[PDB]
């Protein structure tokens, strides 16, 4: 019964086109609840789940304040980084930040994290101990020293270990019906003939939540991850996820192949035969 | 609830 709250922040420079784009999305497990989009009109933090709308103006006022703060820092970061790497003003660049906290079945703090990436790859990240930084390069080292002097970690550790978990539980409870839910997959199989000497078996997992799932193809023991095709667990659009896996099986042995579905909404891992 | 002490890089 583990859980987690995570925030993702995207910053994209718009060379010759004004202020950068800023997008902030908040999640609790695989369910999003808040968001901030510089392109949007409210120009404030907005709810994206029913259970968060019940919060007071105090909540949204301070959530919008803090999110704008993030924006300001990312707006300045884009320039700073462009400098460190002495890049041109001709190209677009991306900054991404991600912090959150994991709790166990008892909801007690488990892990904390705060990553920072630039142009698609790590730049700096807080270490598991929440006391030290990991610089990805010589430039990142400058941020590291800068941050050690500013006692930034000390602040994130306080947040990640307390406030973060404190509010995660608040959400987990307020959204009891929604978040503490655990929908089971509606599995099945489909046969597809492409040739006279072959066929395609597709194991399907649908309407399941959380997205955490593992589908496996097996020859009554034999692993077959070599000829299997798994598509990224995709969202359905109603809060549930989908996913499937297939293998090219020569006509005949197909009756010996069995699929394995592992999800926390299932007592015992399913095994589907054909 | 958002973190409250983001600092420049």
């Amino acid at each position: 019964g583990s859980h987690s709250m995570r925030y993702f922040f995207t910053s994209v420079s718009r060379p010759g086109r004004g202020e950068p784009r800023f997008i902030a999305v908040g999640y609790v497990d695989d369910t999003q609840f808040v968001r901030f989009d510089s392109d949007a009109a409210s120009q404030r933090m907005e709810p994206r789940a029913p259970w968060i709308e019940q919060e007071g103006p105090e909540y949204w006022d301070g959530e919008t304040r803090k999110v704008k703060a993030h924006s300001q820092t990312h707006r300045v970061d884009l320039g700073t980084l462009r400098g460190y790497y002495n890049q041109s003003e001709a190209g677009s660049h991306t900054v991404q930040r991600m912090y959150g906290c994991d709790v166990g079945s008892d909801w007690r703090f488990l892990r904390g994290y705060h990553q920072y990436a630039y142009d698609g790859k790590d730049y700096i990240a807080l270490k598991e101990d929440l006391r030290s930084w990991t610089a990805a390069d010589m430039a990142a080292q400058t941020t590291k020293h800068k941050w050690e002097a500013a006692h930034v970690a000390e602040q994130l550790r306080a947040y990640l270990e307390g406030t973060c978990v404190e509010w995660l539980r608040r959400y987990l409870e307020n959204g009891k019906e929604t978040l503490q839910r655990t929908d089971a997959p509606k599995t099945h199989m489909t046969h597809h003939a492409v040739s006279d000497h072959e066929a395609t078996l597709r194991c399907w997992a649908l309407s399941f939540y959380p997205a955490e799932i593992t589908l496996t193809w097996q020859r009554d023991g034999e692993d077959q991850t070599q000829d299997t095709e798994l598509v990224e667990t995709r969202p359905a659009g109603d809060g549930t996820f989908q996913k499937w896996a297939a293998v090219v099986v020569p006509s005949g042995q197909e009756q010996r192949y069995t699929c394995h579905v592992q999800h926390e909404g299932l007592p015992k891992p399913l095994t589907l035969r054909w | 609830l958002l973190f409250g002490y983001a600092v420049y890089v």
Partner: T-cell receptor
Amino acid sequence: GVTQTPKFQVLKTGQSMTLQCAQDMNHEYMSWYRQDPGMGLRLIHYSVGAGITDQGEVPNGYNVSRSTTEDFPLRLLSAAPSQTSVYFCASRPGLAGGRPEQYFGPGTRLTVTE
Amino acid sequence: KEVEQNSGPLSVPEGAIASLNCTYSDRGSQSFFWYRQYSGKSPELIMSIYSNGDKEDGRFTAQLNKASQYVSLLIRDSQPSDSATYLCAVTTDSWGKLQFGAGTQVVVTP
């Protein structure tokens, strides 16, 4: 830390006074407060960074600017007997530092007569 | 206001314990401070607490209960020099406004 001058000041209803405030901690968040026996501390004006200024709880009668990040001069164009009190200056790191503590200045005591 | 403190002089004898309470309303508060202000001087920061629990430093002990949105300050082995009025301050973020209490005046008799 936070330095501010003058320490004491006498003014006649109508004089122009400018309370000087400076900080050397590379802070981006400075604030001005006035303390009175019946209300305690009350924000007048504050600035989260250079060029950015916003009114507080009792901004009336007071002017403020922030061309640089080191200073944050509080101005009174036409002194009023009501503006008699103790003015404390203050600063916070803002987005420049993780230490959330706000620091006060030594304070200036001002009195306005008719 | 948004932060409430013990309204009135808390007279304590030399060597005794002075206990200070504080209560805030914004559940989003993340930073909590304790300020000491001697008559005629400026507010001096003496305690900061960022996570709920106990923080001890010298004869000062600060507690934090976010669940009950409560903050305290325990001054051990009181000295007449501790005679001052103590301000409770709390905030939400680096851009949030600092919210102070009326301040509880503490008199340490000799």
